Structures are given as C-alpha cells and as structure tokens.
Design a protein around this ligand. Sequence first.
Ligand SMILES: Nc1ncnc2c1ncn2[C@@H]1O[C@H](COP(=O)(O)OP(=O)(O)OP(=O)(O)O)[C@@H](O)[C@H]1O
Ligand SMILES: Nc1ncnc2c1ncn2[C@@H]1O[C@H](COP(=O)(O)OP(=O)(O)O)[C@@H](O)[C@H]1O
Ligand SMILES: [Mg+2]
Ligand SMILES: [Mg+2]
Lengths: 49, 489, 49, 50, 47, 348, 464
Amino acid sequence: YTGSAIGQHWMYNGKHVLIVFDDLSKQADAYRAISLLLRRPPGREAFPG
Amino acid sequence: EEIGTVIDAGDGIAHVEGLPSVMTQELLEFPGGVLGVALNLDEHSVGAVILGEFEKIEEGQQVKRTGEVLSVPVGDAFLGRVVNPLGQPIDGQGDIAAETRRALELQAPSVVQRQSVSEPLQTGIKAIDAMTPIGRGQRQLIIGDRKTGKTAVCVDTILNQREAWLTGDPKQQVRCVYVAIGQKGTTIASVKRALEEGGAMEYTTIVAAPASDAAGFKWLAPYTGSAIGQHWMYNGKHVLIVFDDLSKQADAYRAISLLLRRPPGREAFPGDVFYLHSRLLERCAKLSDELGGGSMTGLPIIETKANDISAFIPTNVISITDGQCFLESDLFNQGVRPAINVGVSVSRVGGAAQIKAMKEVAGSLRLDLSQYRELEAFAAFADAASKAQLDRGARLVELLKQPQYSPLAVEEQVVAIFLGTQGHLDSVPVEDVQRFESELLEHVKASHSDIFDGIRETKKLSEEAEEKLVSVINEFKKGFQASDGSSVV
Amino acid sequence: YTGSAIGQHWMYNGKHVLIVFDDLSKQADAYRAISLLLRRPPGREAFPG
Amino acid sequence: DGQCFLESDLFNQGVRPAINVGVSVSRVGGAAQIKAMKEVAGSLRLDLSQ
Amino acid sequence: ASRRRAMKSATDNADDLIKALTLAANRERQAQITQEISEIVGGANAL
Amino acid sequence: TAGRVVRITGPVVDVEFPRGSVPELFNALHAEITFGALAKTLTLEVAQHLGDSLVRCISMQPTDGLVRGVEVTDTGASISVPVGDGVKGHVFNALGDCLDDPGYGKDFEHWSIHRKPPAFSDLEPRTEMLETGLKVVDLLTPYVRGGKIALFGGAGVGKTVLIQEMINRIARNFGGTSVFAGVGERTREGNDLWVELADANVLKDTALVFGQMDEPPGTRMRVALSALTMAEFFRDEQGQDVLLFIDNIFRFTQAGSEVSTLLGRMPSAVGYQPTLADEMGELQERITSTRGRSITSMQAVYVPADDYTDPAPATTFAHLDATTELSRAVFSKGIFPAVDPLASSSTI
Amino acid sequence: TAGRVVRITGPVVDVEFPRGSVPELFNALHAEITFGALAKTLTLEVAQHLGDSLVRCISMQPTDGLVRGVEVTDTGASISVPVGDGVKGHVFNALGDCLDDPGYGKDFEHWSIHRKPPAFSDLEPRTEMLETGLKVVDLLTPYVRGGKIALFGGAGVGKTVLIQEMINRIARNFGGTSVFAGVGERTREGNDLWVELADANVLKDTALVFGQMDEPPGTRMRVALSALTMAEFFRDEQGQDVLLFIDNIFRFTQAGSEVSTLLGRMPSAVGYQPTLADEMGELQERITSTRGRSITSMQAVYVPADDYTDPAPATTFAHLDATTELSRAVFSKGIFPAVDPLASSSTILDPAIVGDEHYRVAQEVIRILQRYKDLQDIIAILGIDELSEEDKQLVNRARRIERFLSQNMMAAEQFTGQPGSTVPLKETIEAFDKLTKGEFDHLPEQAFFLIGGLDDLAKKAESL
Ligand SMILES: Nc1ncnc2c1ncn2[C@@H]1O[C@H](COP(=O)(O)OP(=O)(O)OP(=O)(O)O)[C@@H](O)[C@H]1O
Ligand SMILES: Nc1ncnc2c1ncn2[C@@H]1O[C@H](COP(=O)(O)OP(=O)(O)O)[C@@H](O)[C@H]1O
Ligand SMILES: [Mg+2]
Ligand SMILES: [Mg+2]
C-alpha cells in the first residue's frame, strides 16, 4: 500500500514508474494470521472471508 | 384461539414463540397464505421450515395452527390433472374436489402381509422384456448419465397401458403417477404434450416441482407422489409410479441439514440419507389375497458422473433396490438408441412371472451376446464358424434397435424374437433389416391375423400356428426387395 | 503403566527385565475417545494435543 | 533406537521371517553383538540391499 | 508389419489408462479438499 | 423512524430499528459518509433478520471511514433500475448511474430486479430452430429460440468479431437489439471494447453494463439481475426479439460463495455454499419464450482446471443447449470464421 | 411418581422427574399417543443423566403426533423377552410379541437383555475341522465348530446367495437348535426364507426375530441382544448345540452413529461417534463357547463405498478367526463365488492341525497367485510376449487355477437351472496337486468353469 502510494504521486505528474513486489504469498499469510487471531469465519484453507 | 408470534426469521428457517399445545410435525398457518411444518420443539420456542415462497414472511408476524398432522388430500378426481406437491392445482384447468385425507408417514406392511409376485408387467421396449423380465410389485432401477434417453423409456412404459385401460376389466386396469423434481418447465410441457398425443393423459396424474422453487418442495415431492398410490393400494387396484430423479432431493436434504447446523459425514452428506431412501423404496409392496392385492411398482432414475458406480448414493440405492439397468453413453453416441449394457444389467426376482412362450422363444440370448462381445474383442486385431457366429451376433444386436415411442405389444414382440432367434435374416443385409422387420409384421396384421389370437388366448405358440407363419414368411420374403438385398430362396 | 512400574521396581534392585507391549494404537484410540468425550477441542485429524 | 518392517508381500512371497532389509536398521549395531559374530557377519546388510 | 500393428495397439492401450488415472487423481483431490475443510471447520466451531 | 449502526466489522453491517418499522428482505437503505476527504453515499440491502429489531445487511461500496451511531434511511422498495427505449448507446453501472454522463436517465421509468418467472401455462411445448445467415453453424450446430449457447476458448482469436456479427445480424435480419453485461471486467479491456464498438458505429441498438473486477462482493450478481431486467422489459412491452450477451458466468458463483462465507453459514463439499443450485436455477429460468417472443443468450464459461466433475461446471451444464468452440488452428490456416466443427455439438 | 416431557426433537426425548424418583441408567418407561389417526403406546429406554432430575431417553416407535406435557410411568425394570422351550417355530419382533398370534407367549418366563460376559477362567480355545462341500473354503480357509465366521462384502456382490448356501449346507444335518436374526434388511428375503423353510420341515426347530430397515434406528440396536438372550438361554440350561445367523452388523453400527449424533456429542472421524469400539466389543464378547458348552455363529458385513480402510469394518476385523472377502473385479470377471484368495485367512491353517499334505499345496498356490498379480500390470500394458518362457507358463497355469476355482452353486436353480454338486476334500487336494504340477496344460480354459468334481471336468473336456 505504501509502495503504491509513493508511486502514485509521480504517476499523476506525467512521469513513468515501475513498481516491483518481491512477494505476495507472505502478505496473504500475514492477513490470514491477523484475521484468525480475532474472530473471523474461515473458508478454504482457513483463509478469511 | 391459540395464536403465536415469530421471534426470529432466518432465511429458510423460522422460530415461533408461545403456542403451548402443538403436535409434532403439525401444520402451521402464516398470514401470507404459506404453510410451515414444525420438527423441533423446546420449552422456549418451536422451530419450523417454510414451504414454497418465504420472502413474504418476516419478523413480528402472527401465526395460527391448523390442528392437523402432515397430510395430503386424496380422491379419485386427480386423474388427468397437474398439481404441485402441496396439492393445489398449478394449472388453471379448474378446481379439484377430494374425498379423504392421507398421512404421509405410515408404516409399511409387515412380513406376514406380503405375497410372492407372479403377474408380468409388460412394456413396449422389446430390448428389455426378453433380456431382463419385469413383474408387477417388483422394483427396478434405471441408472445412467446425462443425455442418454431414459425419460423416453419412462414415457414409453407409461404409454404402453392403452390397451389394458381400454379392456375395462378392473383387475387389468393400471393407474400411473409421474413426479418431476428440479426440472425445466419446457421439458414438463413437452412430456405433457407427448402424453396428450397418445391419448393416455386421462388415467395419469403428474406432480410437478420446478427447478426455480425452494428446497421444501424438492424435499416433499416423493411423499405426496406416493401417497395417492398408497391410497389406491388398499382398494385392489394396481399402481405404477416413476421417480424422475432422487439425487436432486438428496442434495436438497443436504442443503437443509447444513442450514440446520448439523455436523456432516462424507462429502457433507449426513448419515440419515439411507433411512429416507429406505423408507421411500420400502413403501412399495405386493399385498396378499387377504388384503385384496395390488402393486406399487416403482422405477427411480439415478444419474452418475463419468460412469462412477462406486460412489456413495449409487451404492446406497443399489443396495436398497432389487435390480438395475445400466445405460452407456459411449454406445449411445454410436446411434444405438436403446443403449442398455447387458453386461451388468440383471434382475433377480424376474423370470417367474414371465410368459412361458416368452421364456422358451428366447433361447439363452445372454450367452450369445456375451460370446459376440468377446468374439469381436478378439477379432479387433484379427474361422468360418467364428465368422458365422459374429454375423449372427451382429444381426441380433442390430435387431434390438427401436425408434422413439412406438411401444410394441407382446404378440409382435414374441414374433420378432422368434424371427431373430430361429436364425432368419441371415441372407438379408443389415441395412435393410429395420423396415423389413416392420413390413412383414404389417402383412401379418392384414393376413392371418388369427395367429395373434392364439397368443392372446393360450399365451403359448402351437405347432400349427408356427408352421403357418413359417410358410407365410417363406411366401413373403420373395415379395420384398432391397438395393443390395435378395431373397434367400 | 502398571507393567512399567513393575519393571522399574525389579530394575532398582539390580535385576534384568524385559517388557512386551501388545499394541499402542488401541490405547491411543482409547485416549482419543476419553478426551473427546470430555469437552476439549479436537486436534489434528481428530487426535487431541 | 531401531525398527523392523514386515510386509505381507514378502510373507506371501515365501519368506517366513517376512522382513525387508531395505528399511530395517539398528542404532547400536555391532556394539551389542559378540565379537566373533562381528567378524563373521560383516556388512551383509549392505550387500543384501545392493 | 507386425511391429507396426503391435505398437499401434500399445498406444491405444496406453491412452485410456492415462484417462482412468486422471479421473482417479481428480476424485482423490476433491475428497482430500473436503476432508481438510471439514476438519478445520469442525475444530473452529467446536469452541 | 430511523435506525442506527451497531456493528461495522468487515463489509457486513448490523442495523437497529424502532419497533414496527423493520424493513422486509431485499430492501434498499442509504447511509452517507461525511467524514474526511473520502466522502460518499453507500447503499445497503437487508440480508437477514436477527431478531430484537436487528437486521444484518451487506454493503455495496467499501465501508472505510464509517462511524458508529450514524443515521440511516430506508427507501421502502427493492433495488430499482431505469428502463426505456432511450437507455441504449450508454454505459451503466450496477446501481443505474450513468458513467458517461452523470444525472442521465433520472427522469426514466424505474423497475425492480427481483421478478418471478412466468407461469407454467404460458410455456410452449415446442422447439423452434432459430435460423441466421451463417452457413457455418446452421449445418452442424443449429440454434434454438429461447435457449442457451455455450462459448469458450477466446484466446484472442476474434470473438469480439463474433459478438459484433451477432449484434448487426439481429439488428438487420430480425430488427432486434442487444444487451451486454460484464461481471468481472478488467478496466482496460472494457475501455478497449467500448472504443472498438464506437468505431464500429454500433453503440446505438446496444446497451452496456459493466461490473468492475475490483469491487466489494454484491455487485457481481446485481449486474446480471439488472441486465435481465432490461432484457425482459425490451421483450415484453416493445414486443421485439432481443439477444443477451453475458460473459464470465464462472466467478458469479465465486462471488455468491464469498458472500455466503461472509454471512457465516457452514460450507459444503469442495467449499461451496449449500444453495448454489437454487440460485443458478433462478437465473437460468429467468429467461424463456412467450407470446411469440424469446431471449437467446450466449455465455462464456471457464472450467476449474479441466475437472468437468467439479460442482460449478456440473451445475452449469444442466441448462445449456449447444456448445461452440473457438479453435486456434483453423484461423491460422486462413479460415477467418474460426470454429471447431468436431469439438462442437448441439442437442437439437 | 410421574414425569413430564420437556423437549422432543425426534427419536430422542427428554423427561423430568420429581425429586427422589429418578430411574436407573437402564430401564423402561411407557407413554401414549391420544390422537385418533395414530393412537399408539410407545416404550422409552433411558439413555443418560443430565442433572436437575432430568434424563435423556430414546424411543422404540415413531414420535409423530406427540405433544409436550404428557404423562409417563416407570416400569422399574429393564425390558424383557419371553424365553423358554417351545418358542421355536415362530417369528417375533424386537419387543417380543408374536407376529401371527398377538397373545401367544405371554405366559412364558421372561429374562433380561443386559448381561455381563462370562468370566475369563471358563474360556477355552477349540480347533475342529468343519467340513462344507466347497472347494474355496476347504482348500484356503477351513472353518471351525466353535468359532465365529464373517462374510465381508460390497454392494450387489452376491453375499445373500452365500447365506442361503450356508444355511442349506449346515442346517440340514444339525441336531441342535438354530436361531436367525435380521438387522436392517428388506422383507422380500424374509418372506422368501419363511416360505423356503416352510417346506423344508425345519421351521419347527428354529425361531426367527425380525427388525427391518423401515423402523426407526432405536429399534435397530436391540434385535441382536434379543437373539443373544435366546441363544444364551438355550446354551446355559438345556446344554444343546447352538447355531446363530446374523446379517448386516454394519446397519447396527450406522444406527449407533445416527443415535449418537442425535444425542449430541462431538464426532470422532469420517462422521462417526466416539466409543464405537467399546460398543462393538461389548456386543461381540458375548458370542463365546465355554469348555462345556458350544455355540457357533456366522455373520455378514457390508463394506460402504468399497472402502476397506473405513473405521467401521476395520474395528470389527480383529474379532474373527476365519474371514472371507469378495471383490468387484472378480465379480466382473464372471466368477460367481467371487472370493479373493489373497485377502482371506484362517487361524487353524498349520501343519500341526490340518496336516502336512494341505500346507505345501496351499503355499504353492498362493505363491503362483501372488506372482500373477505382480506381473498383471506389464501383462495389461503390452501383452504376454515380453515375458520369458517360465513366466509365460506360470501365467498360463495361474489363469487355469483361477478359472477352476469357481464351483457350481446349490441355490442358483432359480437362475441357472443347472443342478449343483458337492465335493469331498481328498478329490480337491489331488486335483490341485495335479494342477500345480501341471498335467492339464493342453486342455482349453473354458472347461475350467463351474464344474465341481474333476470327473465332470474330464467329461466336459470332450464336449468341446
Ligand atoms: N429410441 C429413441 N429413438 C430416437 N431418438 C431417441 C431415442 N431415445 C432417445 N432419443 C433421443 O435422445 C435424446 C434423449 O433426451 P432425454 O431428454 O431423454 O435425455 P436423458 O438421457 O433422459 O437426460 P435428461 O433428463 O438430462 O434430459 C433426444 O434427443 C431424443 O430424441
Ligand atoms: N452363483 C450365482 N448364480 C446366479 N446369480 C448370482 C450368483 N451369485 C450372485 N448372483 C447374482 O447376484 C445378485 C445377488 O445380490 P446380493 O449381493 O445378494 O444383494 P445384497 O448385497 O443386497 O444382498 C443376484 O441378483 C444374482 O442374480
Ligand atoms: Mg432426458
Ligand atoms: Mg448380497
């Protein structure tokens, strides 16, 4: 989120930006953990709603 | 005066407070004209599942009781009518006046009240009567996959009873009941039109449950489908009932159980499915002479995915039922319209009720068919005797092909069976067989029609009649010509 | 456990012992059943912690 | 500290002990055995596995 | 010629075996998915 | 006469109402966010009664910036969409707002989207073969009036050409119209399609509705419902045949399952909602043929990893009537109208 | 003195009692249904305690039409079964009253149905060679006189025909009293058995108890106990040989699972209940023969969905001493007995008891079958050409042995209309020795198919 927020300021000024995300699976795992820690109905593979 | 109120209004489940004096499975009235059934009680509330449409009901509504157990109206005016599972006329054809009521949950007759089956039930499909004999009061199973042509078999079996109905003898008259669960309305309209075409619509009652309705109707369809036949049982008549598909109502029951917060078993199926399927398939019985007699022959249909016979529901149904018939889609794609696999299809109870002439006109065709199958399997990569055997097997296999509808009676069925089994049509090319097998019959209907009279009366073939028909066909094959066919001479 | 206790008692006096167990799966299943009858959360593949 | 594996296939095959040398080991090894057995036997398990 | 015929027969024998194995694998995967989802939902709502 | 917000967890929202004023199911409500720079209005629909004047509802747009204890009003009627003869040649969203020109269509006539399929008596026990000028499809896989036709295998072989071909053919030969609905749409693809259609001079006699891929669940069903509402309004009052283009039938079911999981009901085999069959049956039986008019339809499907035994394709195939396959070799051979005759079959 | 019904959720009912009158953990209670259409009198069995003078119970009749607040009364003792000499020759249900004459048997002496198993001291192993005129059973898995035998099957695999065959083979020459039980079957076979034993002149000796699949699950857990009480009485006092037939224990397990789920208890695995093994052992430990008393039992079990790994058949498998298994593949092959040699075993198969003649022949046969099963995959993928000469001949004689192992049935006259046969053991031993040595190489395979004795095989050899 903060990476895209940084990029968007330049992208709204007629300038070209390239953004790379090193990984996204760990992001999903972190979200799943933070959801499971509180009350969230789990779907497939205990993933949140 | 015993009035209650809804406390919570779930999606498919409602909870009612008050109303102390209420029976189990009693019918409840709602202000919108919809009805519910209560299945779970408590010192504080009563649960219920809503039938039909439920978007009308909501919290704070008034509820009144009807003071009657789950029951369906029943009478003799239902003949030639179309109705929903509850019992209201779905069509605008008019209103119905019943004669009495029937409870849905009634125990089956015990072992002492039963009786052996000895009366054959004819069907127009000649490919199964000679292959797998059926008798009334005996259950049979039709299992297959999508787009194999089984509703056609059902409607042909329904249509075949025209002569029996026109005979007028109450011991011979057979009623029919048809149900449809989760089907498209176009198919229902088409089958109703087809039945109307054959003039058999008057002695048939159809219960319709479309695919766009709630789960309650899909759950309740078979009970009200069989209740009418159960009522006609104890008056001495004979009843036939067809279940369009049992898988859909099983899925509906799974859905309602999951909505009711019940722990699941295999693939979310609860362990109660066997109980209900056993109830449905055990309601049928062959009564004894003391009660008066009758029959509840049922023909449920089950669909499978990729020929999965080792699944859960198919194995349960196979265990419950008596026999089964298998339809192979690979054979269906080859143009063989009556595609029934003789390999696994079999009946145990059948054979005693079969006509003796029918039993002796077909000389063990099963071994011939299996021999032809193994012979072609061997000859796939590759003997005069084997050549003759495979030619005879090909002729016999091609003989069983039948067009849509046209349910044949017993006389022409046994005549064709004699023609094939004896060894005729050996010189006749296969391509011209079909029409031949028709035209000769028509001539027999015109000249020497007395032959059918002997079969109607004594139900056996005599020497004089058989030699007369042999001479007749010997004097007919020279009168028929084909592009590549000539008389054997 | 009783066989283990007897073996220990014969151990501490300087003798030598040999103990044979019929089966451990049956007692594991018995433990699972008794734990599950008590209101305790189930574990992985129904086997409690 | 050691495992012995018996498979029904070998028992059916005709080997009465019905034990496979592939996945049967012993932590202690030659230390337990008497010395004469140690020199006589050698590394027969590895030869059998090979 | 015999080698040609035999090899063709071998290919026509292998293909349907592949199909059957694929069907078995698919049904096994579905059964596994159902098993773990049932186990996790039961453990979750057992509280 | 006005409610309040009790719980704001996730997209779902719980609302409290005074006695005797609780709205029924499938009813619309409005709540406005006025805090911060990100100010907007949200629409909610009643999803379930919890008792004691509590109602659980699902939001339509993200619930960020909402505050507890805010005031909420109820429309009193279900979701409404404007219809008419002037709605074509304009892009619309699920809620009926006109993206091309805000404020458009405010003076039109509005209809609801929750509608009942026709009665049993009105069904016609007949099968009429729909004919067109294409000799490619007539000889092998004839079409059926009022039926469903399956189409899959786009792969950039020119299926947009087929879509515009159908549009112009129904415009000329039969004097019909066309409605296009997108369930999960990439913005660039939708913009490119709009530009191409504008260049082709066929925006007139064609209505368009889009549902963006990046959207809270709830729109992915209502887009199809609104498209069907417009299609049936065209069929009935105008008495002229229409053709409906619906793509992306697959993740419609995924959106439904997502909503079901969010509500908290127990899942079913292979992680699906326990009421998928009823919803798909309602959607399929929405279209039919009556009074001599009909609605044909073409749908795009995506199999879950070639497992035809999966519940979603198995449920879907219970209603299709014909299958069309797009091949990537016939057009490489030079045959511009690309089909796979061997892989395509029809029940007619 | 009298209780109140507090909640009815189906077969299970919860009832409250005044202080000091709570009943025991096993007991019987009565209640009535006053509706006109379905007036009945129903019996409740107490199941468990809940505190606050409240007890949860099950029912033996459908609960339709029952209303809250009705009155219930306590009998004070567990349910009873009319037991005694002369009850043979009649059919009964779980409760005990005769089907034909309602008043019959009311005056007899009554026992209980809950009884502890016998003490460990009286237990005594026994090994006797029971003989039946079948090739597969005699050669592979011989039976025992005082043991328990089981028949594992799938769906539509022909197990019922095997039960008819066994009753025809054994019940004819037996001098003792037999007893048959039915758990969750269909009444067609009940009527068939009744009429078939009517003219066999044996019905006078045997008593029947019937519990079918149309009844609620509560009644599907008690008929086994009733039959066991009958057998216990006939064994303990009269000192006669006792034979017991039991079908579909799996139905009893399913009923237990359903009632457990209704009671409310966390499921164990694959949708089952805790303590299934405890109930299974509690039932199965009462069918035992002491050193001075004898009893034999044959049971049938159904494998769900052809899964041999399921807990329900797995738990029961280690309580037998001679098991036989049926497979779908052999059924499709056309072998009607359809018994798989490689998944059936007997405890008494050893040189000490059977002798040195049988052992080597059996070992050679099983080795040949195992080798054929190992090579079948390469056989399927390519063919028989790739193998060596010795493996080719091994495969040939393995096919010959497999085809020969089928035998013409005795109760198939309804279907085949070809009279069956019975074979003495020595003829089978000599024939199988000759087959293993391979003296029938030139004979065609088709001859080795439902032939019985080797003399009939020789006769059929020239028939081709
Ligand atoms: N004996 C027959 N002669 C000619 N055509 C036949 C015959 N049997 C079936 N067909 C054709 O095959 C198709 C059968 O469709 P049908 O509705 O019976 O399918 P099904 O296998 O019962 O499945 P479903 O219930 O899904 O429709 C039709 O196109 C019908 O014309
Ligand atoms: N030896 C045999 N001869 C002829 N038919 C047989 C034989 N064994 C089995 N069958 C066939 O198998 C069927 C037996 O079904 P069965 O497995 O007893 O059903 P269930 O498992 O429900 O008891 C019968 O219909 C019969 O036709
Ligand atoms: Mg059909
Ligand atoms: Mg059987």
